[PDB]
Amino acid sequence: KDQGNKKRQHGLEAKKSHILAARSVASIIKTSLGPRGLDKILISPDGEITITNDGATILSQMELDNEIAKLLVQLSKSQDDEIGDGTTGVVVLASALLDQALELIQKGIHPIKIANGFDEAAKLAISKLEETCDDISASNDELFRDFLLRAAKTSLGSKIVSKDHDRFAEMAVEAVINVMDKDRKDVDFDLIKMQGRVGGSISDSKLINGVILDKDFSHPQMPKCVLPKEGSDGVKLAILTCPFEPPKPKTKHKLDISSVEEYQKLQTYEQDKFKEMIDDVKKAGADVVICQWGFDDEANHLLLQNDLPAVRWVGGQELEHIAISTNGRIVPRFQDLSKDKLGTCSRIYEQEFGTTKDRMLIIEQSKETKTVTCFVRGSNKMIVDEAERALHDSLCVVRNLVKDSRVVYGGGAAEVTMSLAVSEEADKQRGIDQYAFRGFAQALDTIPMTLAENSGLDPIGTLSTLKSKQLKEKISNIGVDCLGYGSNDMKELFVVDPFIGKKQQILLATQLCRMILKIDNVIISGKD
Template identity: 30%
Template sequence: MAGPLMRMPNGQMIQPQIVLLREGTDTSQGKGQLISNINACMAVVDSVRTTLGPRGLDKLVQDDRGVTTISNDGATIMKLLDIVHPAAKSLVDIARSQDSEVGDGTTTVVILAGEFLRECKPFVEDGVHPQNIIKYFREAAQMAIARVKELSVSIEGKDAEEKRELLKKCAMTTLSSKLVGGEKEFFGQMCVDAVMHLDQDLLDPRMIGIKKVMGGSMRESFLVDGVAFKKTFAYAGFEQQPKYFENPKVLALNLELELKSEKDNAEVRLSDPGKYQEIVDAEWNIIYDKLEKCVASGAKIILSRLAIGDLATQYFADRGVFCAGRVTEEDLLRVTKATGARVQTTVNDVTPEQLGTCEVFEERQVGNERFNLFRGCPGSKTCTMVLRGGAEQFIEEAARSLNDAIEIVRRAVKNAAIVPGGGAIDMELSRHLRDHARGIAGKGQLFINAFARALEVIPRQLCDNSGFDATDVLNKLRQKHALAGGEGANFGVDVNTGGVIDAYEAFIWEPALVKINAIGAACEATCLILSIDETVRNPRSEGADGQPIHAPGGRGGRGGRGGRGRGRGMRR
């Protein structure tokens, strides 16, 4: 930054420089920086572009620990990519926000944001001020969202059976682009059944458990109308316990049922050696008292978040009671929700109201694992999916796919409005914005037309990923959508034949909320990146010897929390 003019002894006038930033600070600004940010975002988009749609391909991502993930879920891929460019990280944020807000459409939102930026690039290169573009892009996004709401069809007010069928169609549309797309009808029905088991006021997704068991085919997956969890760590005596009950009482605990004396590092001084036996007997009396009270409560199934030792296991087996210790907190929470049991921290004064129940409890072999199943729970507000598959990576991706489908069904239940998929809604929005742009004078017409062109990227990418001629299909779609009276508004890409199809009639549906959120988030990310005109990278702090200084326990600390600082760490 320049200061006031100064006169040198030789009479020359100079303007001294004022140093604001530390030496080594990297600053980039102006049009070049903006175009650089746009290019970085477009490079990120190209990495997920081919995963869109039913014919989309998967990505294999390997992290620094050698863990590999195969997925075509946009949010998963964006999270696993180690993106270092500061502007491109905004695309990761919108993918995550779409995933948390809606559950699906993560690839769509990233591709839309990238295409908006691609359309902006020529304007920026020609010297158009970014704020002009931002103004009209926001206006176009608001119009597009309003049009989606106009075109949406409500499934509210349908009878229960018809509504389940409509929700199944939404789930199948989501699953068609996933690895389990070949069995989308089977899993679509499972997702709808799972959501319908939840409390319809809360629709808490945590109440749907997903368990993965390697081996078998996808068709061997099943839904439990209650809770299922893997057999916990078992002590001697476990095999003697009964593994099947009808209408049992369930006691849920949060305390240990095992001898504690060996764990305590206590010192006891005795003047009389005979007193030692009394201390040992006291330990046994305490645990036997607890076990007797558990059995006296009338419970036939005893679950605890903490350990149930070998003594307790054998004691319960002798009395025809089933027990399981070290049940995970998530599984115990779902058991209490399903059976109505309340978690106890003491076994004193356990009343019948604190016990839960279910119609059937059984232990069942699933592949190489044994599962404890609670079925037919009263007023069950939870359920469990047990997924089968031939490979671990396949099951992991199946679980991610089903999570997307479950989220879509949840959103469709809460916001019962759907729009045609297959790029139909995108083409209709594009046509609507083009028509509107004709009535705008000045540069705004160009910007809204650019926004409308960008929306066509979804059907174009569906064609590219399916191996069809995108230009030919888009021309057919433009022709259909240009029909008067909105007769062609439901036509989208037919990924099976490479033609066009009435997406609504073909039951290719998606919740309106997915498209509304995707357009809004993509537009916000675009406006954010366009509003950046300078990037400043501060230099890393360095020690007296020029070596970078890291916080204690950082990359250089051999001892973790402040080790001896070898390697790239702080030198002593």
């Protein structure tokens, strides 16, 4: 099928071509590794120019015909959710592993043995990391919170928000606390909604304990706010999914009035339906009517006369958020609405951010809730995007830190320690295992060298000094000058990376290397 314009490689150039393609893909974001990584210009087909050093963003927006590169990019897309901030490091490590595998194959080693040896080396490196890891939560709660805030600030400082990034870190920590419990120590990002718009400043960030529902209340005369009514039991919400209109035909409609009899009959039917719905709403005791669909003119008029602000076109996920925040339930229809299923919230009011005149509607609880929304604003679209990315990274880092008390330190110190351990263990295992361990150690050496290169330091001398310091004197956390630092020994600089994060990075790099190596034949057809 589609034999014409079909290309394939197998037996001679498959391995070399795949490894070269992987190296070329890696070189796209290799220079962007680290906080001071060089930026790349990304331009949309419409001509919108953007600047960012995020490896995940760079790879996601890149399309290509190479099969190995496409597979690597697709795997990175899935890994972005698992870690997020480690995509570039994982890609670089996989590229280094493939480069070493090239030499190993040139020496006569079968790919399966290379993959098995890399897996064993990854296991040994993870064991070494676990042995050398330190516990923060088991030392002091104050120190644990300080390290959480420090990680959030470090993530935020790489963007424009660095001027006032403290507020973003505090909001992220509060959202994680509200949404995550210690039973599982996992943050449910589905309950942490990310929303924002162009305008305002970085100081307009706000954490909401419920859904936003920035709606216009349908009818122009419909009140735009639901007040607590001077100390009353908050605001009662009618969670409904049935549209606030009587059944209508789907074929003709055109229910026009031609005489008195037809007018009377149609008015009787429609008014009876609307009165039934509005009476059910009133009996339920709800103060605000929320429907998954829109509202009819008669329904809007009746709600306005009864002082019942309306919310139109609320999505299913929004309804679930309403139920979670207000401890309510979703009522399929008006006839099933009762006071026992209405949700309660502190208030539904309009909130202004900076100079914004939209006056968006927000549902606020002011109490601890299982679902929150992270609101992000900024003077430019780039500011908002960077703030959202930094908030996501901070949330992931906090989740990783809380999930596992064991942590490692950045700047390549963990990579250097793993490389030293793997090199030491290599001489103990005979056969192809020795070559595999040496290759894995050399690949691990790539990350600190790349970081040093990105920081303007000599990778050779920097790596040699790091190895000497970590071997001759003692095992510690010594890395490269990723940022402006007085000296080395990140341990005193408080550059901490979660242990689970590093373990996931290593495992994903090994898996990607195996996936690329295990493909010995590629076939691609033509295009129409």
